[PDB]
Amino acid sequence: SPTKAIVRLREHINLLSKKQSHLRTQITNQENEARIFLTKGNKVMAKNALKKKKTIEQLLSKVEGTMESMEQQLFSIESANLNLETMRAMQEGAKAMKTIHS
């Protein structure tokens, strides 16, 4: 059923939002690593920690983009159901017109 499909998509998004929070935390951690090297004076390793920060940022974008795709599919399903209800409404309007003509 499309309701079950929606529930599953929400379940996948929830798991991805756990990955999101993890990766956002890792981004802060990689920044902190770089800041530690900056206070040590090792700008080379600080830049390398920022390279790792950017790597996690790219992974975060992948997770967030995946959730977007799942939401688009989810909303498409809900929209399809709203279109079926709009169709039903139009069919009852047609029935009213049939009564007017009859």
Segments forming the whole domain that contains residue 85:
2-101
C-alpha 73/C-alpha 71 separation (Å) is 5
C-alpha 27/C-alpha 53 separation (Å) is 5
Residue 88: partners with Cβ closer than 8 Å, 6 or more residues away: none
Q: Are 74 and 10 in contact (CB under 8 A)?
A: yes
Breaks in the chain (C to N > 2.5 A) come right after none
**CATH code of the domain in which 8 resides:** 1.10.287.1060
Q: How far is CA 37 from CA 23, 45, 49, 51, 52, in A?
A: 21, 6, 9, 13, 14
Experimental structure resolution, Å: 7.1
- Total number of domains in the chain: 1
Query: ∠27-38-43 over CA atoms, to 5°?
Result: 95
